[PDB]
Swiss-Prot record:
Cofactor, free-text remark: Binds 1 Mg(2+) ion per subunit.
Modified residues (4-aspartylphosphate): 56
Cofactor(s) named in the record: Mg(2+)
InterPro entries for this protein: CheY-like_superfamily, Sig_transdc_resp-reg_receiver, ST_Response_Regulator
Species, as recorded: Escherichia coli (strain K12)
Effect ascribed to mutating residue 56 to A: Abolishes magnesium binding
Primary location recorded for the protein, binned into one broad class: cytoplasm
Keyword field: Acetylation, Chemotaxis, Cytoplasm, Flagellar rotation, Magnesium, Metal-binding, Phosphoprotein, Two-component regulatory system
PROSITE patterns linked: RESPONSE_REGULATORY
Designated name of the protein: Chemotaxis protein CheY
Length: 128
């Protein structure tokens, strides 16, 4: 994928945002910004330029499922890649996010290898 692709990393835990940012850096992506909840994320997205979202689920203000749904329903960002990265492991959680339009889904804890595999799976699906 284009190494200038602009990522938004969304999680309410600074530790997890730091994990994902550093993994993205290793993969060659340095155009990375962070958001602390779904509301903060939408403000950033509204500000423009983003080409990929990685999001947690359980967050205050607006959770990741609502964020996903919002993005998918918005005509300005409907096809924006969204990878869910969440401690929600239940099949009904994965179904709800899949059906809402998740581009992929990674369960915490995850390895560096899993994140790269699931990112690449999305890049290939979208011809990126
Ligand atoms: F709080 Be997240 F769904 F890991
Ligand atoms: Mn969380």
């Amino acid at each position: 994928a284009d190494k200038e692709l602009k990522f938004l990393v969304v999680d309410d835990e600074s530790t997890m945002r730091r994990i994902v940012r550093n993994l993205l850096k290793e993969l060659g992506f340095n155009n990375v910004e962070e958001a602390e909840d779904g509301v903060d994320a939408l403000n950033k997205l509204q500000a423009g330029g983003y080409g990929f979202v990685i999001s947690d689920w359980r967050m205050p203000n607006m959770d990741g499922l609502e964020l996903l749904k919002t993005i998918r329903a918005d005509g300005a960002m409907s096809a924006l890649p969204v990878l869910m990265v969440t401690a929600h492991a239940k099949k009904e959680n994965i179904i709800a996010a899949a059906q809402a339009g998740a581009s992929g889904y990674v369960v915490k804890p995850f390895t560096a290898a899993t994140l790269e595999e699931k990112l690449n799976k999305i890049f290939e699906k979208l011809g990126m």
